[PDB]
Amino acid sequence: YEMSSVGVINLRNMYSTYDPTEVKGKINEGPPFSGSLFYKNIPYGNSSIELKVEMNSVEKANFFSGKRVDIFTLEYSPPSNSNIKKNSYGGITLSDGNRIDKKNIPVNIFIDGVQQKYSYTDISTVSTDKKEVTIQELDVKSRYYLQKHFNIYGFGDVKDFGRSSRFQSGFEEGNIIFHLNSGERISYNMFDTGHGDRESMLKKYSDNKTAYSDQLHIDIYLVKFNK
């Protein structure tokens, strides 16, 4: 299955365990490199890594350059290697004045329009310590909660929904919706494997899209697999 359906396995592995790359209050090293910013000496794996954070525009990299930021991101292997250098997309928010005590984001989970249990009193409850937070951070936290409690990507402990889909789960269709106060709806297909590789699935996050953490709710619409 890994040889001939790698996208399913890569997507599964992206969100099934919770180990985001996080830095608090750091400044990038040297000037920006077009759309990218470098952060040195981040604890990782067997030692440390230099993290190259890419955004979708020179304007964005320039904006954050020389400012303290928090990073919350999913990294990938770049573009050769080594093991002490990793790449990522977006995940950056200004540090100064952005800290708050954990704020839970309102979350609704549906299966074919039928609301499901969701706990606000857990460690993995979707929350953030940031006034302005990236959609990437909320997506990572939400999909981890989903895998933990609904086994959407397969091979988890929850057997309630079966295992018949192409993800060896109850599901192979559904969107996560970030409803901003503005009326803007950001919608991602939760079962999109992109071009099969990890990087292709992370590129969406290059927009570094943010929301205020008390100015959105998250709706998760799963479609139960029949067949």
The residues binding Mg ion (CB under 5 A) are: 179, 219
Q: Which is nearer to Mg ion, 160 or 184 (CB)?
A: 184
Q: Which is nearer to Mg ion, 16 or 142 (CB)?
A: 142
In sequence order, what are the beta bridge partners of 22?
Answer: 72
Q: Which is nearer to Mg ion, 207 or 219 (CB)?
A: 219
Q: Which is nearer to Mg ion, 11 or 216 (CB)?
A: 216
Shortest reach from residue 145's CB to Mg ion, in Å: 17
Shortest reach from residue 174's CB to Mg ion, in Å: 14
Shortest reach from residue 132's CB to Mg ion, in Å: 20
Shortest reach from residue 217's CB to Mg ion, in Å: 5
Q: Which is nearer to Mg ion, 160 or 214 (CB)?
A: 214
Shortest reach from residue 180's CB to Mg ion, in Å: 10
Whose CB is nearest to Mg ion? 219
